[PDB]
């Protein structure tokens, strides 16, 4: 780990108290940048398409949505592509609301896993795609390293991990109010490397305002 | 989600 956190219990407890007050809505998941949900989803669809479907590329039977919240990414990115999707999130309230939010698309959701990711083992060799969006910043370096390694073991043959998150331009940003660390490129790539993953592709998110931290998508295996 | 510059 680049940064050790002494007090991981207090760190993760504060994130829980934060998300208890987050509305279980698409706007709530977006943190009142609801206007960025559409360009986010449109870019995610195209990036997914690059790495899914075809010889050697990832299959389309099963995906895992990590830090799913109520399932915004499942609803508009994953469920239109995969035969079945599973959600994992630490907030039971978000997972329960996902059943209402997903409407008919929720009929293809096989499981709602209520776990914190640093305490979660993605089922062995089960997934064609594991999607990790806007939650990696909540894991400490040690825990993200470990979680990425376990995600790799959750992949079927030719499967991939897609990581989509804020990447600070320079250095990192520790946010004590929601227990998150926004990493820079060098830190994140180092952790990706040390987990045993290789970058199959990367893409900067377009259509976001300049006053936002950049967002990047990475395809890994 | 998205976050403002610091
Ligand atoms: N340690 C942890 N383990 C599992 N989920 C966590 C977590 N820390 C935060 N979360 C969850 O991460 C989500 C971040 S909000 C983003 C949700 C979704 N990825 C989307 O893009 O719309 C919340 O649902 C929150 O409960």
Q: Is A163 annotated as a binding residue?
A: no
Q: How was this structure determined?
A: X-ray
A89 lies in which domain range?
A: 1-221
- Take atom 17 of ligand 1 and give the residue whose Cα is closest: A69
Q: How many domains, in total, are found in chain A?
A: 1
Q: What CATH number does residue A175 fall under?
A: 3.40.50.150
Residues in chain B closer than 8 A to A211 (CB atoms):
4-5
Question: Given in angstroms, what resolution was this structure solved at?
Answer: 1.8
Contact B1 A213 (CB under 8 A): no
β-pairing, A180-182 with A173-175?
antiparallel
Of the candidates A65, A78, A220, A61, which has an alpha carbon nearest to the alpha carbon of residue A156?
Answer: A61
| Number of separate helices (H) and strands (E) present in chain A | 7, 9
Q: Which helix (H) or strand (E) holds A58?
A: none
Contacts of A150 by beta carbon, 8 Å cutoff, 6+ apart: A120, A121, A122
Contacts of A125 by beta carbon, 8 Å cutoff, 6+ apart: A153, A154, A155, A156, A157
Contact A215 B1 (CB under 8 A): no
Q: How far apart are CA A161 and CA A130, in angstroms?
A: 5
């Amino acid at each position: 780990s680049h940064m050790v956190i002494n007090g991981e219990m207090q760190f993760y407890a504060r994130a829980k108290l934060f998300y208890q007050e987050v509305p279980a809505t698409e706007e709530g998941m977006m943190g009142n940048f609801i206007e960025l949900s559409s360009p986010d989803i449109q870019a995610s669809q195209k990036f997914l398409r690059k790495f899914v479907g075809g010889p050697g590329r990832a299959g389309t039977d099963c995906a895992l949505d990590c830090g799913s919240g109520i399932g915004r990414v499942s609803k508009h990115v994953l469920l239109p592509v995969f035969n079945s999707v599973e959600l994992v999130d630490m907030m039971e309230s978000f997972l329960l609301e996902a059943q209402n939010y997903l409407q008919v698309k929720g009929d293809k959701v096989e499981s709602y896993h209520c776990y914190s990711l640093q305490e979660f083992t993605p089922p062995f060799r089960r997934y064609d795609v594991i999607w990790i969006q806007w939650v990696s910043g909540h894991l400490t370096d040690k825990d993200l390293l470990a979680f990425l390694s376990r995600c790799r073991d959750g992949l079927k043959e030719n499967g991939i991990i897609i990581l989509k998150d804020n990447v600070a331009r320079e250095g990192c940003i520790l946010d004590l109010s929601d227990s998150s660390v926004t990493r820079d490129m060098d830190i994140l790539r180092s952790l990706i490397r040390k987990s045993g993953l290789v970058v199959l592709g990367q893409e900067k998110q377009d259509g976001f305002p300049e006053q936002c931290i950049p967002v990047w998508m990475f395809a890994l295996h | 989600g998205p976050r403002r510059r610091s």
